Amino acid sequence: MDPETVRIALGLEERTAAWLTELDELGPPAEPVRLPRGEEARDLLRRLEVPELDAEEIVAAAPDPDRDPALWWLLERTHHAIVRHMGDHRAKPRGGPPLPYEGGAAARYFHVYVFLATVPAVRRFHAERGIPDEVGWETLTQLGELVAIHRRKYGQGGMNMQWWTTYHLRGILYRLGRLQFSLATGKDGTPHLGLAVPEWGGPLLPKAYDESLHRARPFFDRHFPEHGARVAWGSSWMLDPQLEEYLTEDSNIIQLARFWTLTDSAPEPGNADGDSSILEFVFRYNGQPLDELPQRSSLERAVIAHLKAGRHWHMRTGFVKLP
Numbered sequence: 104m105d106p107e108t109v110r111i112a113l114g115l116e117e118r119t120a121a122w123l124t125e126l127d128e129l130g131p132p133a134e135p136v137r138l139p140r141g142e143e144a145r146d147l148l149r150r151l152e153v154p155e156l157d158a159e160e161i162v163a164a165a166p167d168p169d170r171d172p173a174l175w176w177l178l179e180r181t182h183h184a185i186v187r188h189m190g191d192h193r194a195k196p197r198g199g200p201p202l203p204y205e206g207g208a209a210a211r212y213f214h215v216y217v218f219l220a221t222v223p224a225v226r227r228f229h230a231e232r233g234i235p236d237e238v239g240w241e242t243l244t245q246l247g248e249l250v251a252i253h254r255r256k257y258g259q260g261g262m263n264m265q266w267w268t269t270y271h272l273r274g275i276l277y278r279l280g281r282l283q284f285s286l287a288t289g290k291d292g293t294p295h296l297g298l299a300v301p302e303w304g305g306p307l308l309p310k311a312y313d314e315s316l317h318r319a320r321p322f323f324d325r326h327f328p329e330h331g332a333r334v335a336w337g338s339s340w341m342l343d344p345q346l347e348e349y350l351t352e353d354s355n356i357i358q359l360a361r362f363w364t365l366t367d368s369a370p371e372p373g374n375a376d377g378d379s380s381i382l383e384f385v386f387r388y389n390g391q392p393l394d395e396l397p398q399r400s401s402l403e404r405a406v407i408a409h410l411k412a413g414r415h416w417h418m419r420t421g422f423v424k425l426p
């Protein structure tokens with residue numbers, strides 16, 4: 104197939120042409136793409152904590168190279184475009200575009216098939232790096248979380264956070280308890296660990312947070328000794344000191360943010376670039392009228408009150424030294 108024919112068949116916008124040309128030149132992977140099917144697929148989906156409803160739909164809709172040639176062409180090359188950067192955190196996280204939902208369940212779940220086809224490659228990388236199986240699996244379970252999030256956010260099955268799953272699938276991100284850590288480098292090339300907080304797993308309890316922080320250096324120094332990070336960095340809505348106006352002392356965010364050293368400038372009050380982040384993480388916002396959003400928690404109340412007041416939320420950046 105030719106990349107223009109693929110683009111047109113799948114309903115992809117003209118701006119995706121450059122990506123598809125790149126994928127055309129890259130070509131099919133040396134290891135042919137294999138999707139698990141039937142109970143094999145159900146077993147893997149369940150290991151990845153994908154909800155039963157979604158898993159059943161994913162297995163039912165799995166595409167076929169003969170009936171779905173354009174989608175299959177893209178599946179092979181998208182998988183290839185990820186595994187070519189296995190272990191490489193310097194590569195940008197390019198998972199490819201979302202497919203228009205006019206292509207049905209195969210299109211909606213496209214990046215889930217990408218993830219399933221890539222599990223064997225990343226598990227091999229985990230083994231080569233000596234990563235314990237339980238860490239490898241715990242890391243990959245965010246697929247189920249992100250599937251679940253799609254359904255909450257939009258109302259039908261899907262997974263449109265494929266940019267983020269490139270980290271898991273390249274073996275550059277690991278969940279070590281409540282927190283995730285990714286191999287990362289600053290602009291001057293200095294190694295650090297990027298810290299992230301997956302939604303599933305309950306509140307960010309101080310004891311769970313501290314336990315994750317204690318695991319970070321031992322884990323990376325054992326399996327990625329060439330990296331040598333001494334610091335964790337984070338950029339997040341939850342590092343915004345404005346939260347202190349609204350959250351109480353019993354808030355986990357308030358207690359733990361006090362350990363962080365913020366390194367960006369106090370943002371301009373009128374800068375609205377951080378509103379979308381907090382609305383995504385608190386509400387999985389999809390453009391609904393602000394006063395239709397729930398108001399059951401202190402944070403839900405805070406986000407809306409602050410925005411109603413004409414004020415803005417800002418992503419802030421900081422670090423903590425690794426124990």
Ligand SMILES: CCCCCCCCCC(=O)SCCNC(=O)CCNC(=O)[C@H](O)C(C)(C)COP(=O)(O)OP(=O)(O)OC[C@H]1O[C@@H](n2cnc3c(N)ncnc32)[C@H](O)[C@@H]1OP(=O)(O)O
Nearest residue numbers: 299300302306307337339354355356359384385400401402
């Ligand atoms: C702060 C130290 C760490 C700094 C790390 C910065 C780098 C992080 C880079 C990233 O990963 S940005 C994305 C971060 N991840 C998310 O936002 C995932 C979705 N969010 C969550 O699941 C929770 O917000 C989280 C587990 C992170 C924290 O929940 P907690 O319950 O521990 O937070 P906290 O104790 O401060 O909550 C105060 C109140 O807000 C409520 N709340 C917290 N998160 C909420 C939420 N996401 N949606 C609705 N309510 C929420 C919480 O229930 C409680 O309600 P009440 O006061 O009414 O009892």
